[PDB]
Specification:
part of a larger assembly, 9 chains, A alpha+beta (240), B alpha+beta (239), C alpha+beta (228), D alpha+beta (233), E alpha+beta (240), F alpha+beta (250), G alpha+beta (238), H mainly alpha (86), I mainly alpha (146), D: 233 residues, alpha+beta, Glutamine Phosphoribosylpyrophosphate, subunit 1, domain 1, 5-stranded antiparallel sheet, 4-stranded antiparallel sheet, 6 helices, 9 strands, globular, H: 86 residues, mainly alpha, binds adenosine-5'-triphosphate
Chain lengths: 240, 239, 228, 233, 240, 250, 238, 86, 146
């Protein structure tokens, strides 16, 4: 009876209703996944199609915060760009006072202290964005971290948010991940990406893919469709 | 339960804390006043004096200057606030530009200050009103009023409080244009309204008259005691 | 089910702004008229008792020398906007050596149309009729407490804004002279007043490039009265 | 209205009584017993600390936290908001000590703290202190024992008691303790009134007896507590 | 008793009780973890664990062991989101005392300065009480090791051996009888009793890689923990 | 946060101040004081709600609190709630001596403290002061003056007062006692004794539960006579013989 | 009903209704269709008036030289952002001496409206801005919503019953990329003519039109400026 | 606003109505009065008619009491429906 | 079952349902004559309803899509006259959250106005007229909102 009003108050069951509503708020958004190979980290984003809707290559949830770091985000898009600028401004403070690459561990920790703080106050509101953080460096290596709206900082080799299909991360164990060079990895993930998330719910869709690792020498950028072209090349013939 | 809004206001067409503050106005102490070419008269009653206390602490009339007189109706709590407030306002006005602005600066001060006093958050509107008394320059009278909404207005007659004090202003309209040509009858109007207004005790009644530019003094029970006797005689002349 | 009054209700829109529109019901009405020769505007003071002094309450004030204005609803609510708007046009003549004409006054007030807020205050329900003569000649503009400025050549406010404008929109055809609209307004005036027309009841606002200022005069207010 | 910066949450009941401040007295009543005695040379305090589990050692956490070398003190009821005003009193007692150059009396600690403690209750958005402080010490050759309350009202008692059944222990301290006695005799009846609501087991860690000497406050170790009270009182 | 909107904010009750604060009791239950502290003569040993629902779990990132100072570490319970915001505050005042004071840190009274910030969290108008539970060890000169467990009510608490949490209530029951009587404590004796006190609760007794045993003993005063090597040897040493 | 606000500052629908009406219910209870006109002096008396005899009474003046060597104020209400206003007005009385070097008159002294209590009532939603205290002193203009404070922010100043509950039988008797001033300072105190003896709940006129402080006008020291309770008992038994003499008539 | 009181509450479905209620203010605006081709862009709005004599309210207004925009919804919060829109324009025109690409420009507006949609007591901004501007890569058509999500497109339609324009667009908007300015404007108003009731005009002065290009500076076209655009067209069928 | 005279049309057959009465004049003075509150208009018309011993009721007669019946009955409650569901 | 009982207004049936659920549990022959259940809201659901003999097939019904909303309105009208000259695309996309039963009322209101119109023939614009009619809400318009 109103225990979900103030974000600064607990609940009769001893948890935060504001976070419980924030966890499923990210689930209604389209799927954005991530995975890390040995020398690199892979990102992906699904783009839903209802009517048209608009130009392809628009408002992609894939963003680039820093040289070696990138953003695979889900949920409300405007709240993601705000966290994109905060992570960009935080990356600007590190490159200024220090001048080298910001470690992914503490970069996620800075955002972990932010996302957690907004959930504590009833004035502001929690975040409806659950994103993926991953990076690779020559002196660090490939790490991937999963951040949740509750403010828990941690990471696995892979995680999945967005829509509830979750079958696109199943075939990854059926293929070589840490053994592969991250090159063929791009086209190996996209097979079931097309199969599952059936066309009954959404007639058409579109896929974005991004990668950062050794082949780019630590740089992060979205893999072009024309180069190396084998991304969507092998994806169409792997549906069976 | 309790369902109400505060500010502002209500779709029903009337405000909340404003017109309800008018109830805290009309419930104020009964007071009257008039304007004249020379001597302006005022009055106050319904102070509920028990005869056992000091009259100077319950005095309802102060003066910012000898030219301008203050008359208010309501609780005496916010009074000294405005007394401290307005006196510093007319002081800082006395400070620079020695010649003061005439009657349009001071009447819009408390009025506009009370209007913005209902504007910003954390400010509770005053439930009291006031009517400025005095004389304009070049021998003209000056009187105005304060409204909970901050609207300044000039009256030919001051009628507030109970329905008995409204008769005092009704008697002024019976003097038509010419009356009064003597100050005796103009003071006697307060001595006549003393019986009509309130409990007719002859105690809570107090008045002061400012003739032209001369600073008024509180009436001592000699003049007003002599004019109280002619008030009953003048009413007997009409019989 | 009152949430913050600023919170965009289920319908939805602001509560207090929706309330402040009803605040026009508690106050008098006016009638605007515009013509190529000049702009004439009329009002009614709504005298409750003879104790009311006519020059005490005036519903027409001139913001700038050539720019008149008309208030609505309460008085002191507009008085804060009225008096502060006079500072605007004067500083514009300081920087640019030219006064605001009929336009830069609008955007000045349009920027401050809604300044209200709870955190970081209360919006006024007073409608404003902006008259004046710009480089384009005599012009009359209108705005509402909601904050959206829409150009209204001849506009009426008050609780009579519904009825008074209905017959007024028909008579604004460009073939009508200014002199025909002057006597057309008093026809609606005598219908919307319960008390017989007297020198203290109504006032007029007329501004022209040649005749000024004007503003308005005294004893010429009573001439349009006896002609009723 | 206004900001939301925590305006006062304390209102007046139809009878005029305080709402949340009187509820803080329930925490004092639902707290732990603490007693003190002002007699003759100095003031003697007897508190009660019992471990809820056998794994708790009383040698670390100390109930008595003296404000000054010559000023002792104890508390009753509720810790978290208690240490806030304690350390605040440590910073506040310095202005009197630096400017006036003097071992500030307990009466001035009462005037300054209870004024801020009353201002703390007047400030809303925060729960009032549920701690009833017993202020003692020695000043101007004559010691003092003063009792405060969550509302800020300060009293003066020869022998006072707080906590569970404080009205019953107050009558015992009214009868068994009267006029004034030596500090040794003051420790005696201070433990006897503490053994009233105490359990059937009394050891060095179960009760701790503070004493304010004319030479200034000296906190007795659990050694002297088991030596005098064994064999309590 | 409850009257009005008191249920919807953090304040007292008509009976003087608390609701929000007492709803933080089960705020640890969603995490479902356990931490027990055992201290010896010259040593102190902490026992904890972690849950691995998926093979993607990284041992380093999901590690629940937090190190405040080289000489003094710590551990948390409950939801890990609120714990991390208290981690830097435990590091903050640490470095403040290392800088200004320049010695072994308030091994006793440090829980007062931490609980003060923890009370500010509770004393704030509208803010989350942060129900994470802080647990510290300690090292002092000729005082032996110290063990301290703080709770987010704003008070300082610590003793020889203390266990508080979901299932920690049954763990202290064995420690009361195990310590005394009369007994001493050696290095391996405290490590062996870390499991036996939990053996009175659950102790599924599986591969040690999931459980983490914190240990501090005075030889080199610096706190530290081994990896997987002899912890299993201490697990097979206690069982003969 | 609009529902959590109880609208303390804002008025009641009935025209009364909602917070102040429940405030003055505490003034009718708790503190009890009195005042009367007296020539070449002024007297003050109060009865303690702490009157339980287990206190040390080492505070000397308690309910009688003396703000300045030349001025005292009898307080009715919560002690520490009033103690915020004591030192405040004490500093207001002291800052007056700083920029002037002349004793603060009683008129503007009351209007200064009443506005401090009024500021919390008009805005901020803060808890208003439920303390109503008296005022005594002397000035070179109006001479002896008596005043009272109200929680709404108004000065309740008159030449007489009824505070806060009992003294009832003496109240109407004070209107028959309205004859203005006298001394013989012991005669005016004798009239105060029949008030404390007759109208007390346990009666008996307990000496330890009440304290009488009198201000005697003196040039230029203005000596305040604080009775040591040794001369109160003989002052109590002084009018008890007169009260026994007053009943000899009928 | 007690859990629906505040703004901070997420619905049992996890949606904040305050943004949805601000979406209603955008729908009540006039029907307007912004669009771009692969060469030149054309945006069209609709003027409304409360009374007959009242001049038709303008929507399309020029801000940047190469950036035209329409407006719908709350005018107050629009004029606020309008002064903020002029700011960032002259900012880069002063320090950088170059204009701002619409891509990164609108990213600042989305972040400007993020704070009022978060903190308690703050309100979102109903916004109907349809932005058309030219960076080095050509024209862009974005959208504006109280949720602060801008979508790059060739064309969009907002306002009252403006979804009917998209249905005319989806087939035509793909074929409108190759058409020069002349026929594009008259084909543009052909989309909004079914958005108005078919039984009445659709006059000259009740509609807003503007055109901007790489080498063409954006100019407001209204009243008689629409006469060459409305002439030489076919009426709607029955 | 133009429909308040329709409830006055059925009430124009009540008792004896003078031809000088204008129903459009008093309609605007009583907002949100429906047919119930203006049923009292023609009631207070005949009410004070017999109180004053007169027969018919002119417009100015009862409307002077109508401006009272709206305001004096709005002192305790102004009869809003907005606050019911809100 | 509320939380604190007893009891609700559903007493006889909440014992009846859990008895309807009981004979499915204790008695195996009850697997005969399958029973269909229907609810208008998921807010209150008894966890005991999960069983083979009890509720098994569960599919959440959201608001039908634009293709389905256009369909159902035509397939509810197969029993009656359907107006020609219909794109079916415009009436489909303009429907957001509108109920299927309200789509029947669209052809009702469009058929009710056909009376006063004098012609029983309807146009494609009449659909979207009655579609926006019933929802969102009725009947007012946006003013004073700037
Ligand atoms: N426009 C009107 N025409 C005729 N009579 C009217 C009109 N408006 C109101 N009335 C009369 O006012 C009287 C009072 O209505 P009443 O208060 O009984 O409605 P109600 O039944 O309470 O409404 P609800 O059921 O919504 O609460 C009715 O008897 C009705 O005849």
């Amino acid at each position: 009876t109103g225990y979900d009003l103030s974000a600064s108050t607990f609940s009769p069951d001893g948890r935060v209703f504001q976070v419980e509503y924030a966890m499923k708020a990210v689930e209604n958004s389209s799927t954005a996944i991530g995975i890390r190979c040995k020398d690199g980290v892979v990102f992906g984003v699904e783009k839903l199609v209802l009517s048209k809707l608009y130009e392809e290559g628009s408002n992609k949830r894939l963003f680039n915060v820093d040289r070696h770091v990138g953003m695979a985000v889900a949920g409300l898009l405007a709240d993601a760009r705000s966290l994109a600028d905060i992570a960009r401004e935080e990356a600007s403070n590190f490159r200024s006072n220090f001048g080298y690459n910001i470690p992914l561990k503490h970069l996620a920790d800075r955002v972990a202290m932010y996302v957690h703080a907004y959930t504590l106050y009833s004035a502001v509101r929690p975040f409806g964005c659950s994103f993926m953080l991953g990076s690779y460096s020559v002196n660090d290596g490939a790490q991937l971290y999963m951040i949740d709206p509750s403010g828990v900082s941690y990471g696995y080799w892979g995680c999945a948010i967005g829509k509830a299909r979750q079958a696109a991360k199943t075939e990854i164990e059926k293929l070589q991940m840490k053994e592969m060079t991250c090159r063929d990895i791009v086209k190996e993930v996209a097979k079931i990406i097309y199969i599952v998330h059936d066309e009954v719910k959404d007639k058409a869709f579109e896929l974005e893919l991004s990668w950062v690792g050794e082949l780019t020498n630590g740089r992060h950028e979205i893999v072009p469709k024309d180069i190396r072209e084998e991304a969507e090349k092998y994806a169409k013939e792997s549906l069976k | 339960s309790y369902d109400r809004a505060i500010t502002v206001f209500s779709p029903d067409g009337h405000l909340f804390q404003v017109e309800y503050a008018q109830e805290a106005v009309k419930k104020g102490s009964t007071a009257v006043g008039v304007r004249g070419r020379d001597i302006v008269v005022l009055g106050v009653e319904k102070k509920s004096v028990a005869k056992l206390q000091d009259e100077r602490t319950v005095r309802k009339i102060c003066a910012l200057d000898d030219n301008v007189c203050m008359a208010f109706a309501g609780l005496t709590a916010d009074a000294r606030i405005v007394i401290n407030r307005a006196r510093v306002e007319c002081q800082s006005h006395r400070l620079t530009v020695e010649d003061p602005v005439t009657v349009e600066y001071i009447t819009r001060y408390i009025a506009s200050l009370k209007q913005r006093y209902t504007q910003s958050n954390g400010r509770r509107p005053f439930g009291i009103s006031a009517l400025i008394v005095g004389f304009d320059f070049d021998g003209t009278p000056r009187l105005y009023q304060t409204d909970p909404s901050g609207t300044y207005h000039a009256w030919k007659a001051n009628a507030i409080g109970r329905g008995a004090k409204s008769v005092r202003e009704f008697l002024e309209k019976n003097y038509t244009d010419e009356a009064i040509e003597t100050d005796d009858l103009t003071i006697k109007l307060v001595i006549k309204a003393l019986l009509e207004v309130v409990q007719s005790g002859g105690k809570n009644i107090e008045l002061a008259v400012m003739r032209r530019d001369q600073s008024l003094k509180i009436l001592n029970p000699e003049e007003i005691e002599k004019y109280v006797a002619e008030i009953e005689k003048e009413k007997e002349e009409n019989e | 089910y009152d949430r913050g009054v600023n919170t965009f209700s289920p319908e939805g829109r602001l509560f207090q702004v929706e309330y402040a529109i009803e605040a026009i019901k508690l106050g008098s009405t006016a009638i605007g008229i515009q013509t190529s020769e000049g702009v004439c505007l009329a009002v009614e003071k709504r005298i409750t008792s003879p104790l009311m002094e006519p020059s005490s309450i005036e519903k027409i004030v001139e913001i700038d020398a050539h720019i008149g204005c008309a208030m609505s609803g309460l008085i002191a609510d507009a008085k804060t906007l009225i008096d502060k708007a006079r500072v605007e046009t004067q500083n514009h003549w300081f920087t640019y050596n030219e006064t605001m004409t009929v336009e830069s006054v609008t955007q000045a007030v349009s920027n401050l149309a809604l300044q209200f807020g709870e955190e970081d205050s209360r919006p006024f329900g007073v409608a404003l009729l902006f008259g004046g003569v710009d480089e384009k000649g005599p012009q009359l503009f209108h705005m509402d407490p909601s904050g959206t400025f829409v150009q209204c050549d001849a506009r009426a406010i008050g609780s009579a804004s519904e009825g008074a404008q209905s017959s007024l929109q028909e008579v604004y055809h460009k073939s009508m002279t200014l002199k025909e609209a002057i006597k057309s307004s008093l026809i609606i005036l005598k219908q919307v007043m319960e008390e017989k027309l007297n020198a203290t009841n109504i006032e007029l606002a007329t501004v022209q490039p040649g005749q000024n200022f004007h503003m308005f005069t005294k004893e010429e207010l009573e001439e349009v009265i006896k002609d009723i | 209205a206004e900001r939301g910066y925590s305006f006062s949450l304390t209102t007046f009941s139809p009878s005029g009584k305080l709402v949340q401040i009187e509820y803080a007295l329930a925490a004092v009543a639902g707290g732990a017993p603490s007693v003190g005695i002002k007699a003759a040379n100095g003031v003697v305090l007897a508190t009660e600390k019992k471990q809820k589990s056998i794994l708790y050692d009383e040698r670390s956490v100390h109930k008595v936290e003296p404000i000054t070398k010559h000023i002792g003190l104890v508390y009753s009821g509720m810790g978290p908001d208690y240490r806030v005003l304690v350390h605040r009193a440590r910073k506040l007692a310095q202005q009197y000590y630096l400017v006036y150059q003097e071992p500030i009396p307990t009466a001035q600690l009462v005037q300054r703290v209870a004024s801020v403690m009353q201002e703390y209750t007047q400030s809303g958005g925060v729960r009032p202190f549920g701690v009833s402080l017993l202020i003692c010490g020695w000043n101007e050759g004559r010691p003092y024992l003063f009792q405060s309350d969550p509302s800020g009202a300060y009293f003066a008692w020869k022998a006072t008691a707080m906590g569970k059944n404080y009205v019953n222990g107050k009558t015992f301290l009214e009868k068994r303790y009267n006029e004034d006695l030596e500090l040794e005799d003051a420790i005696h009846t201070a433990i006897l009134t503490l053994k009233e609501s105490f359990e059937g087991q009394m050891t060095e860690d179960n009760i701790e007896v503070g004493i304010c000497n004319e030479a200034g406050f000296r906190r007795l170790t659990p050694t002297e507590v088991k030596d005098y009270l064994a064999a309590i009182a | 008793s409850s009257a009005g909107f008191d249920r919807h904010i953090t304040i007292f009750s008509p009976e003087g009780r608390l609701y929000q604060v007492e709803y933080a009791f089960k705020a640890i239950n969603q995490g479902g973890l356990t931490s027990v502290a055992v201290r010896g003569k010259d040593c102190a040993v902490i026992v904890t664990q972690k849950k691995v629902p998926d093979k993607l779990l990284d041992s380093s990132t999901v590690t629940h062991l937090f190190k405040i100072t080289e000489n003094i570490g710590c551990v948390m319970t409950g939801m890990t989101a609120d714990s991390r915001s208290q981690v830097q505050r435990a590091r903050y005042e640490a470095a403040n005392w290392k800088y200004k004071y320049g010695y072994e840190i308030p091994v006793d009274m440090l829980c007062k300065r931490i609980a003060d910030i923890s009370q500010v969290y509770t004393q704030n108008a509208e803010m989350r009480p942060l129900g994470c539970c802080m647990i510290l060890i300690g090292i002092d000169e000729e005082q032996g090791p110290q063990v301290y467990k703080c709770d987010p009510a704003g008070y300082y608490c610590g003793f020889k051996a203390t266990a508080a949490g979901v299932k920690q209530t049954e763990s202290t029951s064995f420690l009361e009888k195990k310590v005394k009587k009369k007994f001493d404590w050696t290095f391996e004796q405290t490590v062996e009793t870390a499991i036996t006190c939990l053996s009175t609760v659950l102790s599924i007794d599986f591969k040690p890689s999931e459980i983490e045993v914190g240990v501090v003993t005075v030889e080199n005063p610096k706190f530290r923990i081994l990896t997987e090597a002899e912890i299993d040897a201490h697990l097979v040493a206690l069982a003969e | 946060s609009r529902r959590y606000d109880s609208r303390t500052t804002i008025f009641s629908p009935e025209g009364r101040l909602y917070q102040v009406e429940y405030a003055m219910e505490a003034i009718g209870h708790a503190g009890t004081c009195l005042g009367i006109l007296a020539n070449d002096g002024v007297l003050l008396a109060a009865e303690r709600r702490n009157i339980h005899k287990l206190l040390d009474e080492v505070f000397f003046s308690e309910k009688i609190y003396k703000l300045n060597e030349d001025m005292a104020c009898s307080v009715a209400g919560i002690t520490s709630d009033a103690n915020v206003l004591t030192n405040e007005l004490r500093l207001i009385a002291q800052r007056y001596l700083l920029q002037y070097q002349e004793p603060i008159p009683c008129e503007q002294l009351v209007t200064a403290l009443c506005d401090i209590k009024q500021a919390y009532t008009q805005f901020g939603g803060k808890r208003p002061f439920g303390v109503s205290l008296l005022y005594i002193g002397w000035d070179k203009h109006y001479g002896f003056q008596l005043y009272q404070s109200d929680p709404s922010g108004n000065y309740g100043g008159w030449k007489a007062t009824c505070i806060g509950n009992n003294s009832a039988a003496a109240v109407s008797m004070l209107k028959q006692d309205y004859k203005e001033g006298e001394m013989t300072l012991k005669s005016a105190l004798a009239l105060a004794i029949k008030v404390l003896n007759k109208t007390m709940d346990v009666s008996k006129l307990s000496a330890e539960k009440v304290e009488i402080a009198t201000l005697t006008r003196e040039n230029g020291k203005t000596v305040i006579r604080v009775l040591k309770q040794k001369e109160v008992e003989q002052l109590i038994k002084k009018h008890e013989e007169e009260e026994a003499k007053a009943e000899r008539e009928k | 009903n007690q859990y629906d009181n505040d703004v901070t509450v997420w619905s049992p479905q996890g949606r904040i209704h305050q943004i949805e209620y601000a979406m209603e203010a955008v729908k009540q605006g006039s029907a307007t269709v912004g669009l771009k081709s692969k060469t030149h862009a054309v945006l069209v709005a609709l003027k409304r008036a409360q009374s007959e004599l009242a001049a038709h309210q303008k929507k399309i207004l020029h801000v940047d030289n190469h950036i035209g925009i329409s407006i719908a919804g709350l005018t107050a919060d629009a004029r606020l952002l309008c002064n903020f829109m002029r700011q960032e324009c002259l900012d880069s025109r002063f320090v950088f001496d170059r204009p701002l690409p619409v891509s990164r420009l609108v990213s600042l507006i989305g972040s400007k409206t993020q704070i009022p949609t978060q903190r308690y007591g703050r309100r979102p901004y109903g916004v109907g801005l349809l932005i058309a501007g030219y960076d080095d890569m050509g024209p862009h058509i974005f959208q504006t919503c109280p949720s602060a999500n801008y979508f790059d497109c060739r064309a969009m339609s907002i306002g009252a019953r403006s979804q009917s324009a998209r249905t005319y667009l989806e087939r035509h908007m793909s074929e409108f990329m190759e058409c020069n300015l002349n026929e594009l404007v008259k084909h543009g108003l052909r989309a909004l003519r079914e958005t108005l009731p078919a039984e009445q005009d659709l006059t000259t002065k009740n509609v807003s039109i503007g055109i901007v290009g790489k080498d063409l500076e954006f100019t407001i076209y209204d009243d008689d400026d629409v006469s060459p655009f409305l002439e030489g067209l076919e009426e709607r069928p029955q | 606003l133009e429909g308040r005279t329709h409830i006055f049309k059925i009430h124009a057959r009540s008792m004896s109505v003078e031809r000088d009465i204008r129903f459009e004049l008093l309609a605007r003075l009583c907002p949100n009065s429906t047919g119930a509150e203006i049923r009292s208009v023609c009631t207070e018309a005949g009410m004070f008619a017999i109180r004053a011993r007169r027969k018919i009721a002119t417009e100015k007669d009862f409307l002077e009491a109508v401006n009272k019946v709206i305001k004096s009955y709005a002192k305790f409650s102004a009869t809003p429906r907005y606050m019911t569901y809100n | 079952k509320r939380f604190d009982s007893e009891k609700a207004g559903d007493r006889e049936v909440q014992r009846t349902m859990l008895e309807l659920l009981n004979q499915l549990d204790g008695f195996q022959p009850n697997t005969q004559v399958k029973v269909i259940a229907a609810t208008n809201r998921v807010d209150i659901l008894d966890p005991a309803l999960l069983r083979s003999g009890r509720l098994d097939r569960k599919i959440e019904f959201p608001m039908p899509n634009e293709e389905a909303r256009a369909r159902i309105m035509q397939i509810h009208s197969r029993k009656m006259n359907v107006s020609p000259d219909v794109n079916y695309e415009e009436l489909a996309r303009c429907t957001d959250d509108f109920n299927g039963a309200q789509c029947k009322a669209v052809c009702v209101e469009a058929g009710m106005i056909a009376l006063r119109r004098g012609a029983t023939e309807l146009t494609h614009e009449d659909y979207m007229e009655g579609i926006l009619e019933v929802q969102a809400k009725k009947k007012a318009n946006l003013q004073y909102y700037a």
